[PDB]
Symmetry: C3
Subunit: 155 residues, 3 copies
Amino acid sequence: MHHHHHHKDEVALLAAVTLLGVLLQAYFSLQVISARRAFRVSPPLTTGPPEFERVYRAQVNCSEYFPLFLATLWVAGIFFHEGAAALCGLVYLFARLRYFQGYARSAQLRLAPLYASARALWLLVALAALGLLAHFLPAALRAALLGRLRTLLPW
Amino acid sequence: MHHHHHHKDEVALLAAVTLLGVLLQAYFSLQVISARRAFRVSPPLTTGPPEFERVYRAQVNCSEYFPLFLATLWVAGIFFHEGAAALCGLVYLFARLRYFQGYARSAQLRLAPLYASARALWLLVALAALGLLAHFLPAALRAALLGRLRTLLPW
Amino acid sequence: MHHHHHHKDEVALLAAVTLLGVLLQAYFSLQVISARRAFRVSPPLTTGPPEFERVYRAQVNCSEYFPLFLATLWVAGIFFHEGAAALCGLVYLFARLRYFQGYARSAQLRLAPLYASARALWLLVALAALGLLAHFLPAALRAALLGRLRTLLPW
Ligand SMILES: CCCCCCCCCCCCO[C@@H]1O[C@H](CO)[C@@H](O[C@H]2O[C@H](CO)[C@@H](O)[C@H](O)[C@H]2O)[C@H](O)[C@H]1O
Ligand SMILES: CCCCCCCCCCCCCCCC(=O)O
Ligand SMILES: CCCCCCCCCCCCCCCC(=O)O
Ligand SMILES: CCCCCCCCCCCCCCCC(=O)O
Ligand code: NI
Ligand code: NI
Ligand code: NI
Ligand code: NI
Ligand code: NI
Ligand code: NI
Ligand code: NI
């Protein structure tokens, strides 16, 4: 409720990549709705021609991974480096766009961009992990050394 | 780890709408479990009578959009205006409750609240985008003017 | 953009539980891909032998609840108590790991860890709610008393 400082400028690139991700997900959704018309599939019900089922499944898989992407983007961006996390996020999202486009054409064409999206997501995971390790490991190593010291009142 | 200030009071309405959203999602889930009994559908397996499939599909669609709603709510609430973002969030969630209730009765009755939920989500997206533009565009325009200036050492 | 303080040390346990949750979700996904080979189910398409359908459905359900878990973890951790929220989060995630493992073996074996995951999630919801109530209820009670006072200019 103010606050004479804000932390917006520390997360704005994460927020922009997040919004791009929302926009891409919305687009995937609109493509499924468009495929429902092209290939005559009525709600509820997610079975129909192969071409429809591939578009449907591409959207479902993107949707499933999307919170994982968001969680890791934010943890990596806060604990490791904002710019690095955001760049990796852009690469992931572009890879997901290529995955969806590929998959819609052929199951097999989903594979190369799928691998690219996994490499970008795993890099985000590794940056998040390194950032958290940097945060916790020094204090933990110190507390353990201190307990050891201890010895003491001797030597 | 303290900190003689906190930023809770800047995000509390976003946090409350978020929690309401979790509660609504939990409710949708409990309704699917209840429909599984009413219409005799046993896990795993998500096919059964039309009435079950509509309830199932309403929950699935709400679930799919729920991270999009959360992401945009937080970005809009931080970059644009907390109160506005929270209000739009409440409207979205009420619209989703009406969507789920409608859909359970008839595919066709899902449509009006579906359109209401999309208008509320797109307004959140537009507030998020405007907030981010307000954040990045002045510094970007300035850096570009400065490079232009440049000219200079003349005129 | 600096900032001579950071709020990382107030959310690091939430961030670590979040990352563990991402890792567990990634694992569930890899298990579905592994079941697709074991039980010969090719993409798109999520129907096959019972053993495959159980593994698939366990992943889907974990995926569906995962944003709910994340949202509530963060709200509870910020508004109620970071350590308590993180502990409950670990219990939820362990319960989800046991749920997935159970379900893969038998529908019936998913049930005990399912109930454990629901108790942990509902405790997170209750901590989030109590934290938000603590935040809003005093100011609200005060504003209402002040309007009452009022009376006044008399008595
Ligand atoms: C840089 C890019 C950003 C540009 C910003 C512009 C964004 C505008 C995108 C348009 C989004 C439209 O939003 C979409 O509307 C259609 C209606 O037409 C809805 O569609 C709904 O109604 C139709 C027709 O009754 C049904 O057949 C359909 O099954 C149902 O889902 C979608 O559920 C909603 O998601
Ligand atoms: C789903 C995960 C959401 C996580 C959001 C956590 C935000 C809490 C901390 C905000 C303070 C900003 C820290 C600045 C670090 C940086 O430079 O990026
Ligand atoms: C999934 C997106 C989660 C985003 C959470 C980002 C929170 C980081 C910044 C917190 C500082 C609070 C900023 C105050 C602005 C306001 O008035 O709402
Ligand atoms: C999906 C929900 C994401 C929510 C992320 C909200 C983070 C905004 C506030 C960050 C300031 C840190 C507050 C410290 C309280 C604490 O001790 O945990
Ligand atoms: Ni002041
Ligand atoms: Ni201040
Ligand atoms: Ni102090
Ligand atoms: Ni301080
Ligand atoms: Ni300085
Ligand atoms: Ni400062
Ligand atoms: Ni601060």
